[PDB]
Amino acid sequence: APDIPLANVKAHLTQLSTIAANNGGNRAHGRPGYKASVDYVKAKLDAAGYTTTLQQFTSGGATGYNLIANWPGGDPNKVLMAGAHLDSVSSGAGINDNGSGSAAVLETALAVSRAGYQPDKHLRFAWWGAEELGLIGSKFYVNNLPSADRSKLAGYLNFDMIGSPNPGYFVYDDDPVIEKTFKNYFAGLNVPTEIRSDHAPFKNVGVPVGGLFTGAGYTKSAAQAQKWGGTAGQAFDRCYHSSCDSLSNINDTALDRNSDAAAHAIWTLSS
Numbered sequence: 001a002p003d004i005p006l007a008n009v010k011a012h013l014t015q016l017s018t019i020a021a022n023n024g025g026n027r028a029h030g031r032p033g034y035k036a037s038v039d040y041v042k043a044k045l046d047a048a049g050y051t052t053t054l055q056q057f058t059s060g061g062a063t064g065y066n067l068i069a070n071w072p073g074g075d076p077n078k079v080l081m082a083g084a085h086l087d088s089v090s091s092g093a094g095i096n097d098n099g100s101g102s103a104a105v106l107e108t109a110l111a112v113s114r115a116g117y118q119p120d121k122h123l124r125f126a127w128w129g130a131e132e133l134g135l136i137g138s139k140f141y142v143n144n145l146p147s148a149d150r151s152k153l154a155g156y157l158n159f160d161m162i163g164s165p166n167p168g169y170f171v172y173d174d175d176p177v178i179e180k181t182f183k184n185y186f187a188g189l190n191v192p193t194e195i196r197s198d199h200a201p202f203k204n205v206g207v208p209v210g211g212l213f214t215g216a217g218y219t220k221s222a223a224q225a226q227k228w229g230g231t232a233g234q235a236f237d238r239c240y241h242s243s244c245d246s247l248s249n250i251n252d253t254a255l256d257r258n259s260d261a262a263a264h265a266i267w268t269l270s271s
């Protein structure tokens with residue numbers, strides 16, 4: 001798998017930051033900052049050769065969208081998917097939650113194209129809307145896939161809040177093979193890992209799932225600061241769901257590591 005360049009990930013974050021600033025300060029469902037986020041991501045993927053689909057739905061009286069991107073090629077009967085919700089709460093720009101996950105998945109999708117990668121499993125990436133309203137977008141996606149298509153999913157990897165300013169390195173403990181893949185990646189860097197989001201709808205229907213997370217409103221412990229650095233007794237993300245979840249609410253090292261891990265997993269699991 002290629003190394004994902006942190007600068008590129010950060011450049012998407014800067015774009016999302018400006019979009020929020022230009023649309024009232026947030027990128028929430030039913031507000032213009034959301035649609036403007038989808039437009040940016042879609043434009044980057046279309047230029048890269050992906051086939052993109054906008055799936056629209058209505059929730060709480062307003063229209064939301066999911067953006068689905070398929071990389072032409074691969075076994076149609078074995079699809080590996082990776083996703084991240086693209087909406088924020090309305091208090092702010094949602095840079096760490098979840099511009100971090102969204103930009104990492106986007107840069108991994110562009111890396112696929114730049115590398116001319118031809119995986120064995122078909123690759124599909126998704127950016128979910130209205131996660132903050134109760135996983136509405138990912139639930140809509142899953143509820144609307146026919147049984148036959150669902151049984152084609154080989155796995156779903158979720159990235160939600162992967163750049164927390166006082167980070168932990170947590171791996172989802174669901175499918176063991178996915179889980180191991182990520183653990184192994186961290187082991188090679190010599191970073192220890194320890195064991196509410198879009199993966200739920202898929203897990204509920206039997207699709208193997210996994211993912212990475214750097215921590216939210218819980219307090220980092222002494223032992224955790226010992227293993228990862230940062231500040232014990234402070235939340236992993238002091239600006240969770242706050243107006244302060246802006247560009248300076250990102251820890252570059254965590255973001256870079258998690259982005260590279262995502263690419264390593266997607267390469268690894270798609271072959």
Ligand SMILES: [Ca+2]
Binds near residue numbers: 003004005257260
């Ligand atoms: Ca990197």
Ligand SMILES: [Zn+2]
Binds near residue numbers: 085097098131160161
């Ligand atoms: Zn989130």
Ligand SMILES: [Zn+2]
Binds near residue numbers: 089097241
């Ligand atoms: Zn959230």
